[PDB]
A paper describes a structure:
Here we report the discovery of type IV borosin natural product pathways (termed ‘split borosins’), featuring an iteratively acting α-N-methyltransferase and separate precursor peptide substrate from the metal-respiring bacterium Shewanella oneidensis. The α-N-methyltransferase SonM from Shewanella oneidensis MR-1 iteratively methylates its substrate SonA at two residues, SonA-L63 and SonA-I65, in an N-to-C terminal fashion on the core peptide. Complexes of SonM and SonA form dimers of heterodimers. A five helical bundle at the N-terminus of SonA, now referred to as the borosin binding domain (BBD; 1–53), serves as the SonA leader peptide and is homologous to a portion of the fused clasp region of OphMA.
Author numbering:
A (entry chain C), C (entry chain A): 2 to 263
B (entry chain D): 4 to 71
D (entry chain B): 3 to 71
The structure:
């Protein structure tokens, strides 16, 4: 057996790569994690042999640590590979961007002597640069998981575009709830106030999943984040608080000044 | 609904027709007045209900920030 | 006339999105910036009405500021839109990731009253996560243009995966040469030594463009960067110099500790 | 020939997986010469361009700068 992990992009049917679609089409079995029922239908018409990985998330109010969800997803994928199936894992977005299941399945498959690889896809961050007309190169880019920003020591560069992913669960330390609380997001606000003013405009972004749907682009002061409506798919964009300033130290080592830049 | 969305999402000629005239394209693909109204008001939950996936839960979080 | 900017990704033919390929196919005219002759051939078979933007780069040893090259690309795209053509700009990778031409063309077209948009594509960073088996969410990600890192004030977080893009022209201040010098890379090494040891393992990465080609994944100590062989497409990956450490201040405000983390 | 093969292989997951099982057998069956196959096996992209009819295609791929606006 063998494993190829693909992404489907955020948009229905059209944001998958030509090659990745061909992998789904020719697979013996597909393990899916897709945004909605339109997407699920589209997959099932491409290849009817689908196991839905959604089933491994907490059902009906049960307490389940997401680390157990992800292990159960990895194990399901590997059982098909160990049985001899030409296996594809089809995840939304990019299969290895803020997504542990495909890297862990690939590490495990390789360790057991199976062919396994990952095909890049279009992630929610890719959709953001296009939707907001922002280039990450313009003043630089930083990405962190929102809860990892709160739990561990991270220092943002306030000249960059800063992304906090999974902002809807920011501070949710148990990994058993589907959303955080207003008071947790107020603590993140106070933490961010080390670098960003309380009236600094931030953007709640959600990439569209359907071709008739507009993306969510909600501008608001940082101070209003804790009252904002968030969903599991929401990303927080924090645009630069400061303009770029000349690095006179490095310019002097290069023997040049600002006037010399082309 | 699902047939229309899946064609529209993949076909750049139909996408450009749609953007010119959303209601005329949706009507020409048989969408009901209530489906069209769900599109124009951005009501994604109503569209899912109207498609008969009324009862399919979907959590998209595939990573955590706790390490190890 | 109208504008749509698409990406073709890094790999020949298979790494464009299904919808982006359909935009190229139905275009009145395509302005291309593609990696090689195989990709150019592929495009020309999809749509024969192609203007190759490569012509706007300095030819035959002429001194030309890349700002003038980019302006001339934007102007050639807009002339087609203004004439009334259904115009597609097909760039490699993602059309708005370390790529100013599509954002500038979309800004100018909107300001002149034309319809303009950007479709996301698969960039070289999206290929890197797949080829190295690294999730940018694992300890977070930072991207800068290498020269901007030297010329302006940027502070990396050394717990993250740091990317310096366009490392081959690091410190080339004129925007008129195609490569930098070993002396300029040695100044970058000394600058980076504020956060990274001289023996810190870094990675020179190049995404493959052909299906028969393996990516370049060259591991070397940071100290050896100035003697390395770089190409215009080379990206420098600098993996974390430090492990994640517990943010006691925020954890206390949350009322939790390390032992509480799920 | 060289171009037709690479374009199919890049798009077709069935051929891609045939190729990965047996690169030389797949290449030979799609008419590649021994020199084309040797260029693939040694990772010599420059020579592959020549055998395709390059006609010195020049390909600079930098579409941004770090000097600010």
């Amino acid at each position: 057996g063998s494993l190829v992990c693909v992404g489907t992009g955020l948009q229905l049917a059209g944001q998958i790569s030509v090659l990745s679609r061909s992998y789904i089409e020719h697979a013996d079995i597909v393990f899916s994690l897709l945004p909605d029922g339109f997407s699920q239908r589209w997959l099932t018409k491409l290849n009817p042999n689908v196991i839905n990985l959604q089933q491994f998330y907490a059902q009906n109010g049960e307490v389940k640590n997401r680390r157990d969800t992800y292990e159960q997803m990895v194990n399901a994928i590997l059982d098909a590979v160990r049985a001899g199936k030409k296996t594809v894992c089809a995840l939304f977005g990019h299969p290895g961007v803020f997504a542990c299941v495909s890297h862990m399945a690939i590490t495990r498959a390789k360790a057991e002597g199976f062919s396994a690889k990952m095909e890049p896809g279009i992630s929610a961050e890719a959709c953001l640069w296009a939707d907001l007309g922002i280039d990450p190169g313009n003043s630089g880019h930083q990405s962190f998981e929102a809860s990892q920003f709160m739990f561990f020591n991270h220092v943002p560069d306030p000249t960059t575009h800063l992304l906090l992913w999974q902002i809807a669960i920011a501070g949710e330390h148990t990994l058993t709830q589907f959303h955080t609380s207003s008071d947790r997001l107020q603590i993140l606000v106070e933490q961010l106030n080390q670098w960003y003013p309380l009236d600094h405009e931030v953007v709640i972004y959600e990439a569209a999943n359907l071709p008739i749907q507009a993306p969510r682009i909600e501008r608001l002061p940082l101070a209003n984040l804790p009252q904002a409506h968030l969903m599991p798919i929401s990303t927080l964009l924090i645009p630069p608080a400061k303009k770029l300033e000349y690095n006179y130290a490095i310019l002097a080592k290069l023997g040049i000044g600002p006037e010399d830049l082309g | 609904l699902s047939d229309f969305f899946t064609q529209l999402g993949q076909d750049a000629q139909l996408m450009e027709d749609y953007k010119q005239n959303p209601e005329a394209v949706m009507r020409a693909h048989g969408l009901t007045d209530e489906q069209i109204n769900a599109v124009m008001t951005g009501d994604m939950e109503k569209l899912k209900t109207l498609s008969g996936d009324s009862s399919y839960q979907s959590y998209l979080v595939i990573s955590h920030g706790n390490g190890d």
